[PDB]
Amino acid sequence: QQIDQQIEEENIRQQRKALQREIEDDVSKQREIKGQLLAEEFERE
């Protein structure tokens, strides 16, 4: 039974990555939004 659950302990060490993927979305959006907004700043002059 301990081995059965020793394996589960590793199964659980194996959500952070999906948040990491999200981290990159956060980065891309803000980076590109700054460019979109500067393009808007000119359009809005």
Binding site: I3, Q6, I7, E10
Partner: peptide
């Protein structure tokens, strides 16, 4: 005596098995 032997040795397989599960 041989049974306690074989058991105490056998258990170390179980600890190698732990090493094997870690791989």
């Amino acid at each position: 005596k041989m049974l306690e032997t074989e058991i105490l040795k056998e258990q170390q397989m179980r600890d190698i098995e732990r090493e094997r599960k870690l791989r």
